[PDB]
Amino acid sequence: MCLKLNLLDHVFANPFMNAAGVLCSTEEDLRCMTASSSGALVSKSCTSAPRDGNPEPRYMAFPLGSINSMGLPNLGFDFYLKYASDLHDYSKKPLFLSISGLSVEENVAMVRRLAPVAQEKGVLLELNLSCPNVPGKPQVAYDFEAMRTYLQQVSLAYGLPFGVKMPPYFDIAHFDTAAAVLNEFPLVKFVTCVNSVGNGLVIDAESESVVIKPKQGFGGLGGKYILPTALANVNAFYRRCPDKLVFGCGGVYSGEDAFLHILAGASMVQVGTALQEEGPGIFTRLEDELLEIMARKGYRTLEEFRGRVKTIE
Amino acid sequence: MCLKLNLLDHVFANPFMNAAGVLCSTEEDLRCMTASSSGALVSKSCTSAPRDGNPEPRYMAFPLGSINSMGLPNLGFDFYLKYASDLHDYSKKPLFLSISGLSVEENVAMVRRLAPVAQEKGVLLELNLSCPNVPGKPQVAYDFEAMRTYLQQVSLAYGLPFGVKMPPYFDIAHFDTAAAVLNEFPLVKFVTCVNSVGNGLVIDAESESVVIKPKQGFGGLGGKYILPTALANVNAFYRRCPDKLVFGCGGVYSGEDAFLHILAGASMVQVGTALQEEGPGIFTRLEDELLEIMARKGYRTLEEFRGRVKTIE
Ligand SMILES: Cc1cc2nc3c(=O)[nH]c(=O)nc-3n(C[C@H](O)[C@H](O)[C@H](O)COP(=O)(O)O)c2cc1C
Ligand SMILES: Cc1cc2nc3c(=O)[nH]c(=O)nc-3n(C[C@H](O)[C@H](O)[C@H](O)COP(=O)(O)O)c2cc1C
Ligand SMILES: O=C(O)c1[nH]c(=O)[nH]c(=O)c1CCc1cccc(C(F)(F)F)c1
Ligand SMILES: O=C(O)c1[nH]c(=O)[nH]c(=O)c1CCc1cccc(C(F)(F)F)c1
């Protein structure tokens, strides 16, 4: 019985990793994730220049999940590239680097410089397509023409296999269209579903106030709120992108939640809110819990059940 | 006490009603909602002809909410019109009739017939814009040019104040576009936010199976999963449509949840999943709970706090 995976020409001890943005912003964070029992790690989505991000409070968690409008605080691309080129211990586990430029040009500039490090050290790119583009237009993955432009430009500039981080969709026509755009790009080898459910609003009844300061309290939702949404997206893209891997993200708190993601199609399984709340010890727990479900069912490997969710009649 | 309010030229004993689709399909259902303590009721969204809807199982509930792909089973427009015209007791409470035709023409045909009954009896129209669209396109409310056409045609055909049931949105640019569309139509006097969060997927770990038969287990989510989504949409439209009313729907299980909807801007508060699970007794509980929270805070009216959610700075 084992959790091993071999994919994207890397070996992973288990499918668990952080979700971008959680426990991955500083060198301290990345050393911490490297020391944990996760199978991989991803660095904080970066911009060319460092960002402070939004005013605090900008993240809050609750029993059913989290809300955030962080504003992309990060130490800048050069820092993350340095970590990938010089600091990361690749004998411990594989590293993904997430990028999230504010324009197609900012992304092209980053990927051009990443590429030799990707080639030499094996760092893997995750391109975050929730980047805002022009304010007053939707986020890039909700503007299909922009998404196509971004992927054309990044594919030409980078020239190596990479993956994309997608927001959730809520309409079958959007699953269809979004997957068809991704399927135009053979270098897109993995699809991470999902980023946070956009622009929710948590209100505290006692104070009669929103709980985060930016955007009048509106921000992206993670956690237990979003698990069925995340599963839907994992499976929609699993079905529509048969030549790509799907990584699942959203609502993972337990080995059972991971097992559902993997039934839906997930290869790697990312952990955001639950990791933010519990800390890196969560990885040993998730591994144990997943293995126990596998033993009960008689499953010896992940591929025995990946994508094998049953439908009714 | 008491929670009585006036709107749309009608008096309501309290702000609570069923959500369309729940406990409102048959004459029995509508008599049961009328006998309840709710302040109003809404009939099941209808088509010109009766529909059997999708194969069962097509609804399932769980601790955090519900998933459905009902396929609009309904007794047909003639039935609901006859209920509004001949059977409903208007001395007990107001009635809303929901329509969701499969094309603009079908909506126009239904609303031309409804108009005289609305004049004579005061039945209120809720137009459900989560309805099918032309090939390749998403649901009408997700296609802003279709939505505008539908509202143009229904406004002309009906000629009387009505409301619109909206799906959730997840992007601030979409809130801006959708609200601008609604604000073109002066006859649209109330906006109900939100319909179910579209195309989630619930998977049962033991069986390794989806839990509803239609659409490979994909369906709309309601209940606790969707409360922050619902609040965000209520507040977004409340802010953007100052000359309209907003009705809140989504994730109401308690008077506290109703309180939060009202703080966000809700005039009426609709109850779907929790009503399906608990039955019509829920209405006395919600009223008692809401009045208890108001008393603890010193609020004597709903107007004192409707839309008064506080932001940080
Ligand atoms: C504080 C915070 C920061 C985030 N920053 C990023 C980011 O920089 N890039 C990204 O792709 N997603 C980001 N996300 C989204 C997470 O990666 C993840 O997609 C989302 O939280 C859902 O997973 P969960 O339900 O496990 O939280 C962030 C989420 C949180 C809570
Ligand atoms: C079984 C079922 C049937 C529904 N039918 C309709 C419908 O006919 N028309 C409609 O506008 N919404 C319909 N909905 C959506 C609800 O009105 C409501 O918007 C949704 O369930 C979110 O509220 P909740 O969190 O209270 O469940 C239905 C929901 C359920 C669960
Ligand atoms: O940093 C974030 O707010 C964030 N939060 C998430 O839940 N997921 C994400 O992908 C991100 C980063 C993307 C993002 C999301 C919202 C705003 C901006 C900004 F404009 F600041 F550049 C960037
Ligand atoms: O009956 C539904 O499945 C349903 N469930 C919801 O959570 N919200 C809804 O608004 C609806 C009805 C959506 C709808 C609206 C109009 C037509 C049709 C079709 F005939 F295609 F089944 C479906």
The tokens for B84 are 């509004």
Strand A218-222 with A65-68, pairing: antiparallel
Using CB atoms, pick whichever of A173, A205, A217 lies closest to residue B138: A173
CB contact under 8 A, A67 and B232: no
The tokens for B200 are 């989630």
Chain A residue numbers touching B201 (CB-CB < 8 A)? 228, 231-232, 235, 264
Q: A46 has which bridge partners?
A: A99
Chain A residue numbers touching B226 (CB-CB < 8 A)? 225
Closest CA to A57 of A47, A65, A67: A67
Contact B111, B141 (CB under 8 A): no
Q: Could you tell me the resolution of this structure in angstroms?
A: 1.7
The tokens for A3 are 């959790």
Q: Which residue has the tokens 């048959």?
A: B26
Binding site per annotation, positions of A for FMN: 20, 44-45, 128, 165, 194, 223, 250-251, 272-273
Q: B103 has which bridge partners?
A: none
CA dihedral (A27, A28, A29, A34) positive or negative: positive
SS (H, E, C) chain B: CCCCEEECCEEECCCEEECCCCCCCCHHHHHHHHHCCCCEEECCCECCCCECCCCCCCEEEECCEEEECCCCCECCHHHHHHHHHHHCCCCCCCEEEEECCCCHHHHHHHHHHHHHHHHHHCCEEEEECCCCCCCCCCCHHHCHHHHHHHHHHHHHHHCCCEEEEECCCCCHHHHHHHHHHHCCCCCEEEEEECCCEEEEECEECCCCEECCCHHHHEEEEECHHHHHHHHHHHHHHHHHCCCCEEEEECCCCCHHHHHHHHHHCEEEEEECHHHHHHCCCHHHHHHHHHHHHHHHHCCCCCCCCCCCCECCC
Residue A131 appears among annotated catalytic residues: yes
The span from the CA of B229 to the CA of B218, in Å, is 19
Contact A196, A68 (CB under 8 A): yes
The span from the CA of A74 to the CA of A44, in Å, is 7
The tokens for B191 are 């906006």
Which atom belonging to ligand 4 lies closest to the Cα atom of B220? 7
Residue B61 CA, ligand 3 centroid: distance in Å? 32
Give the best residue of B147, B174, B225 to mutate against chain A (max A CB count within 10 A): B225
Residue of B nearest to A133 (CA): B173
The finding on whether B227 has its CB within 6 A of some atom of ligand 2 is no
* Cis previous bond, B2, omega within 30: yes
The span from the CA of B109 to the CA of A126, in Å, is 51
Ligand 3 mutation target, pool A18, A47, A72, A100, most atoms within 8 A of CB: A72
Residue of B nearest to A207 (CA): B310
Chain B residue numbers touching A212 (CB-CB < 8 A)? 312
Which atom belonging to ligand 4 lies closest to the Cα atom of B165? 10
Residue B176 CA, ligand 1 centroid: distance in Å? 25
The tokens for A32 are 């911490």
* Cis previous bond, B57, omega within 30: yes
Give the residue whose CA is nearest to atom 31 of ligand 1: A273
- Main-chain phi, psi angles of B95, to 5 degrees: -120, 135
How far from A277 is each of A21, A55, A64, A248, B107, CA to CA, in Å?
13, 21, 12, 19, 49
- Main-chain phi, psi angles of B191, to 5 degrees: -125, 125
Residues with CB under 6 A from ligand 1: A 19-22, 44-45, 59, 66, 68, 70, 98, 100, 128, 165, 195-196, 222-223, 226, 249-252, 271-274, 276
Chain B stretch 51-90, residues whose beta carbon is closer than 8 A to a beta carbon of chain A: 55, 57, 64, 67
CB contact under 8 A, B312 and A229: no
Amino acid found at B105: E
- Domains in chain B, please, with CATH? 1-53+72-196+223-313 (3.20.20.70), 54-71+197-222 (2.30.26.10)
CA dihedral (A51, A54, A60, A66) positive or negative: negative
Rg (alpha carbons) of chain B, rounded to whole number = 18
